[PDB]
């Protein structure tokens, strides 16, 4: 009656994990190696298809994490190494007019540096931040060392390599496809009844930050609360805003870049001095916009924790500076901003905010071992305007009051940041070969 008929080109797929390649329109993320993008990339809507999606088991996040770390190492490899800088520093307090906010944050350190000739040395002086300098001994000898000299080698970032995130697209190789959930109220996990296939993901900027998601995607209609297990306080809550909150971060000090020849063709870039006054770096956010955004976040959290539960926001309970502050890179400078005024509110069911920011010039990105980076100073004054598009929050566990929930900023694992952009994308492999009964028999 019925006979096996073989079909090739069947629109069937399986869950898969593969190596997705790159498409992009002197950069950290290479960009030359990454394939050029194609205009008007095709998007095809799959009608009558419901596909399960898990953001919390998406291998695109792990691949992006590995790729960004590897690209960072590759960018750092050919740049000037600053191993000679591990010498005794003689540091005094800056003698210019310094605001109380900054009195003791910046030190003027003198040291004996090498030159292009191995038999000569030079006496030089550089300005260093207090979060990069360690007292050599407890006694008041005024002799100090760089923070990394005991644990890690330090490499200077190439001044010609910009730290501005640029959008990148992750593309499937032939035989694989990227499925995009188009549901606008998608909680991250579960069936998606509105699916499309794409050649590549949208333009994702690999912005590195903690506690606030910057320059990301916005929720289409409502604030989205996504968590792998909302009952598990060990997992982070990703909040995606439906409206951005504008944050204006500045390093007010006018800055100079002093070039010191430390080898035959190696230059070290020191801060040198500040023209004009010395003022603390800081970020401004609108008070009303932030307050309405927090009201919306609370409204969405009550859908998981109860209509009558008190929602409290408080500052980070602990961790390193990268996770107790809002850390980010803008303008080439690394800011560590105190968000204690962003999360300082109790919400019962019934102007601008200025965040002080500290600067470091010695950065250990991620948590690698034995490798640090010196950030060269940027000349001039840095002014930065960014969109806050989401939060990474942790719920306080072990509560002794069941009528109140407390949420604190978290971060430090960038897979939670890049999972906030890749949450809607899934990689599948195509199974074009299939069999089915028909009435056709081979002669």
């Amino acid at each position: 009656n019925l006979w096996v008929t073989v079909y090739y080109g069947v629109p069937v797929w399986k869950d898969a994990e593969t190596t997705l390649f790159c498409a992009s329109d002197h950069n950290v993320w290479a960009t030359h190696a990454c394939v050029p993008t194609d205009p008007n990339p095709q998007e095809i809507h799959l009608e009558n298809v419901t596909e399960e999606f898990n953001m919390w088991k998406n291998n695109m996040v792990e691949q992006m994490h590995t790729d960004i770390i590897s690209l960072w190492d590759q960018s750092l490899k050919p740049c000037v190494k600053l191993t000679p800088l591990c010498v005794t520093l003689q540091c005094t307090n800056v003698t210019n007019n310094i605001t109380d906010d900054m009195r003791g944050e910046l030190k003027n350190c003198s040291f004996n540096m090498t030159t292009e000739l191995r038999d000569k040395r030079q006496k030089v002086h550089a300005l260093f931040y207090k979060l990069d300098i360690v007292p050599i001994n407890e006694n008041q000898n005024t002799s100090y060392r760089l923070i990394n000299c005991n644990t890690a080698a330090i490499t200077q970032a190439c001044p010609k390599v910009s730290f501005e995130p640029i959008p990148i697209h992750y593309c499937a190789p032939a035989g694989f496809a990227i499925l995009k959930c188009k549901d606008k109220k998608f909680n991250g996990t579960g069936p998606c009844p509105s699916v499309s296939t794409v050649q590549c993901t949208h333009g994702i900027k690999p912005v590195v930050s903690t506690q606030l998601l910057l320059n990301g995607s916005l929720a289409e209609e409502e604030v989205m609360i996504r968590s792998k297990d909302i009952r598990n306080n060990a997992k982070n809550i990703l909040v995606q805003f439906n409206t951005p909150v504008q944050i204006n971060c500045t390093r007010p000090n006018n800055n100079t870049r002093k070039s010191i020849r430390i080898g035959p063709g190696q230059w070290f870039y020191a801060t040198g001095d500040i023209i004009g006054d010395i003022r603390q770096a800081h970020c401004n956010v609108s008070k009303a916009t932030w307050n309405e955004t927090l009201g919306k976040v609370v409204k969405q959290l009550r859908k998981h924790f109860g209509n009558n539960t008190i929602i409290r926001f408080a500052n980070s309970s602990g961790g390193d500076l990268e996770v107790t502050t809002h850390s980010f890179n803008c303008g080439g400078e690394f800011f560590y901003c105190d968000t204690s005024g962003l999360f300082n509110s109790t919400w019962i069911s019934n102007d601008s905010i200025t965040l002080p920011c500290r600067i470091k010039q010695i950065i250990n990105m991620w948590q690698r071992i034995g490798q640090a980076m010196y950030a060269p100073p940027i000349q001039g004054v840095i002014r930065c305007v960014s969109n806050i598009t989401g939060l990474i929050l942790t719920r306080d566990g072990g509560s002794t009051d069941s009528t109140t929930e407390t949420f604190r900023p978290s971060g430090g694992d960038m897979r939670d940041n890049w999972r906030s952009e890749l949450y809607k994308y899934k990689v599948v492999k195509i199974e074009p070969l299939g069999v089915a009964p028909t009435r056709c028999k081979r002669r």
């Binding site: 006979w3 096996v4 079909y7 390649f21 095709q42 095809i44 032939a174």
Partner: protein, 125 residues
């Protein structure tokens, strides 16, 4: 080429069997210059393996291929209207994942090699 890809994924198997060329044409195309190359190589092998299957069966060069393997009701008792008119290929592949390798073995072993040997013997009459 990409345009229309997997568009009939949610269509019925009959409707989705008229777009086989759209999926067929989308199967073929500094450590990042090696890994991407590996991916390209991987795609080729997958394509060749599927083509190899079609060649060990009597289906080389075809997108729709009729065979001499009888269908077994153990594999599926559904009518033709409940497969081609009221069903998608993803649902069919989920049910028949369990039986795929038995059908593949019957396709490989009895029908094609016995047919090929019978043509070898008819050609010398």
């Amino acid at each position: 080429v990409f345009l229309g890809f997997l568009g009939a994924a949610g269509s019925t198997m009959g409707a989705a069997s008229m777009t086989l060329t759209v999926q067929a044409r989308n199967l073929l195309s500094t450590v990042w210059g090696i890994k991407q190359l590996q991916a390209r190589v991987l795609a080729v092998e997958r394509y060749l393996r599927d083509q190899q299957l079609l060649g060990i069966w009597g289906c080389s060069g075809k997108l729709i291929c009729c065979t001499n393997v009888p269908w077994n009701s153990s594999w599926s008792n559904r009518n033709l209207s409940e497969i081609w008119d009221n069903m998608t290929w993803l649902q069919w592949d989920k049910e028949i994942s369990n039986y795929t390798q038995i059908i593949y073995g019957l396709l490989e072993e009895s029908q094609n090699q016995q047919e090929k040997n019978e043509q070898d013997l008819l050609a010398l009459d």
